[PDB]
Symmetry: D2
Subunit: 290 residues, 4 copies
């Protein structure tokens, strides 16, 4: 399966008790496919509140997404974890479900050296008949890998690409040039335009759950070299992202979906519950950009 | 009373990464009988806690309690990015008889102060126990202020904090401002300066093998024998430096193995000790023990 | 004078004793005008090793630059430093010499709050009849200005722009959209293409002293929407920048200039004199990209 | 001259326009000697606002300090800066004046490596018949050298010590143990007690300009192992430092001096001036601790 394209980092619906709301999750999935019209879904990433869930919950979500999607669009499973045993188990689980590729965040919390990180990735991908995408996001893990390290990881032909969610466009350009045969995904929604001109093969973002159409436009307009128009869409997109971040990122995106009849529900505690003020702000945000 | 020296309990894992109960019980016995610490801090970073499944975490808590019984004090670190898991673990360890629980600041996601406060309140209000705050900016990237620490202490069931910041200015301020809260030093290599500033004890990974020297540092300081305490800290830091340069958790386990304690391996992706690491560990053992 | 365009952050020539080489300095200047074809020069910047020079040396440099350039190209004078009195004196000196605009880096070393930084800029520009460009460079200063703070500075109609040398494209995009009437200069040579797509009004770079032609191609191809081409020029540019950084930034740029027929000379101590290995490496870099 | 003990990082008095106020400087000096009774003065440091001054001004201050002090107490001259040429010049000037030792901060702004930092220190000390103390400042310069390099620097027998103005107590302890034959000075006023417990040979602080008596008590009492007694003094001193820090460090220390008849004058812009409110607050601090 060709993995290039726009992927929404799937959000998950939870009830007030923190339990998964399958009805709501399937509505979020339907929204992304039918309305946002994205090329695929990145399941189990940060946006899905993955690291706040139990292994059983992660697996349940993986099942629901595969089931609801069927074979309509591509699916990437983020199976990374500080627990390498769990990562391998999730890798096998998602591979057996039929996910088109897997992805793994660099092991965090503890301070692993490159030899250990390489062991982590190889152990995961060598345990399954699938393809792996490296997930960096130095912003949250604190793990900043160099070009030569990535080059050593890319040694493995099953490690087909990387999701770069760092603000280093120098390294991004260097990776594009050095690894012309690997896939490079942008993970920073508010910087999609400058990433696309550097040659990324697609994008994976949390805001695509509600802004998938514009996000696709920024990408396609740039590939068509209509930079002026692409910039304008990025400007509008960033006005939206700025308002969302100021009102609480995940809570606001979920409230935007609720406005459209998608029961995205609550966020997992300790992520705060939306106040009446955040709710009112969400409505104004919706009226301004949708 | 919870004051004193606590070893952040290391766990014995085998080649496959599985818990080795026999080895774990030997590590516990070594800490009590040889290191002579006042208690164990179970489920912390040192125990490789965050690389484990909830089931394994629970087994370790039960084994530790069973082996220790009432011999020394026990604090269970139940913190997690998964608040539901933390609550389950807080209840489980409270039912087991743990003297207190502790919780690292939720990490990975960037939670604001309001959310961190809810996190802590949710955990301790769920059980009939007492809570110690675990603040480790070095691994989590979260550093609070004196004012914030104050709002948290509004919950009477939060009785203290494990300090792991190199900011002794903050430590000095907190000691005088909250003389009724427990403050634990979490940086083995800076135990002496922490003790002179009033910490009520220490929680460290190196005490698994260096508990006697750790106690001397603490007690000498309390008795104003600062010069002698500094010398013990010098030798202790020579050891800590060798261990850090040779692989922290792996080397402590090798040092225990040298004494017949089956401490075993660390869970992958933490590397297995190479031959060079094993040889170095023998040199280290000969020089400091 | 319209200040849009490509500016070379002028390097200065020094002998082995660390004394200014006037002929060399004039050759660098002439090289930028006649060979690099830049729109102007940014004099007194970090690249000119400004902060390692005495106030009198700074003045001689400003005089030589103006005398040599005359009116052929535009001139921007960086007059900032930790010493404000010196800054105000230099703003006067350069304004009287006829510099088209002045620039001022955020005061560093000490931790000045925003009010102090704001007064620093107003004091400087209000002291003369000129226009000022802000110079952030958070990479070497540690000062991180927010969008709102930039808005406070831009209140002064004489503060016409900013040299953005921080790799935060989110803030850059926000700046472009929020201040459409101000000039925004890119200060990251290795990220020229992505910055240009975000609408910058030009670029001020240290590598333009030897790579002015490609820099212009990147900027112009981009403005013409020929992105595939721009990316290829940026790839070669970054291969060069990568080699330069690995061999010693300033030393290698001067050695490259030497190979271009310019007596760039030595860097001032404690910046190391190029070793034999560095010298043969610089010549390899020369044969490779020039 | 043995250089152990308490040293006030000499504050400098300036007039409205920022020019040196020699009458105020000599009064500050006399205060440090006669009232604070310090072991010596550290001239040309950050506290002296040195890095906001020109070479000529730095020279005048060194002359003023030497002339006013005569031989009553020890003097250390900080001659470091980004410009090595100025450093050597000041090292010679100061040695001719009879300063007991010189000090040099690690060159900042630019990102120098160890080899260059080494050449910098050796060049300075090999040029004069004096002794050198290394100045770190990891907080303002961002230079955090390791134990192995410091060891290399100390290979030169005329490099007698180092000034630790960073709370890294692990490195401090390592330095003490590794170099029992070198001097180590604590540069963090609020943590001089735990630093003394770790074996420092003295302290260099900005608050000693007005709190030299308590500072000496803390140092000596801790040296004598009278911890509980040293702690009592540290309790009050840190309450004092907290009030000073909250009202404006340099401004408040100068206001506390004025309360005692010392015309400490202004601070050098862009540093904010002392307001009526800061004056009122400083008066309360004065009544509470003096
Ligand atoms: C190892 C290193 O520090 N850099 C890598 C080159 O080898 C790449 O990441 C690029 O050179 C990059 O520009 C700097 O990291």
């Amino acid at each position: 399966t060709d993995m290039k394209g726009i992927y929404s980092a799937l959000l998950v619906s939870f009830d007030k008790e923190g339990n998964i709301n399958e009805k709501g999750l399937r509505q979020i999935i339907r929204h992304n496919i039918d309305v946002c019209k994205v090329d695929g879904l990145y399941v189990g990433g940060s946006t899905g509140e993955n690291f706040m869930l139990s292994t059983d919950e992660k697996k349940r979500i993986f099942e629901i997404a595969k089931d609801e999607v069927k074979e309509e669009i591509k699916l990437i499973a983020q199976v990374g974890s500080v627990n390498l045993k769990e990562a391998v188990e999730l890798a096998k689980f998602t591979t057996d479900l039929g996910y088109d590729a897997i992805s793994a965040v660099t092991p965090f919390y503890y301070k692993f050296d490159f030899e250990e990180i390489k062991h982590y990735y190889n152990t995961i991908i060598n345990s399954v008949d699938n393809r792996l995408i490296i997930y960096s996001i130095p912003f949250l893990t604190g793990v900043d890998m160099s070009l030569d390290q990535f080059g050593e990881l890319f040694e493995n032909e099953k490690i087909i690409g990387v999701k770069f969610t760092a603000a280093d466009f120098y390294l991004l350009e260097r990776m594009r040039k050095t690894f012309p045969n690997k896939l490079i995904f942008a993970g920073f929604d508010e910087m999609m335009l400058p990433a696309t001109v550097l040659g990324v093969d697609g994008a994976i973002g949390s805001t695509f759950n509600v802004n998938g159409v514009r996000a696709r436009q920024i990408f396609e307009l740039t590939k068509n070299e209509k930079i002026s128009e692409a910039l304008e869409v990025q400007h509008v997109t960033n006005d939206l992202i700025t308002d969302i971040l100021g009102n609480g990122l995940y809570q606001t995106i979920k409230l935007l979906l609720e406005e459209q009849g998608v029961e995205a529900g609550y966020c997992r505690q300790p992520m705060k519950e939306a106040t009446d003020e955040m709710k009112s702000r969400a409505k104004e945000i919706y009226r301004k950009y949708f």
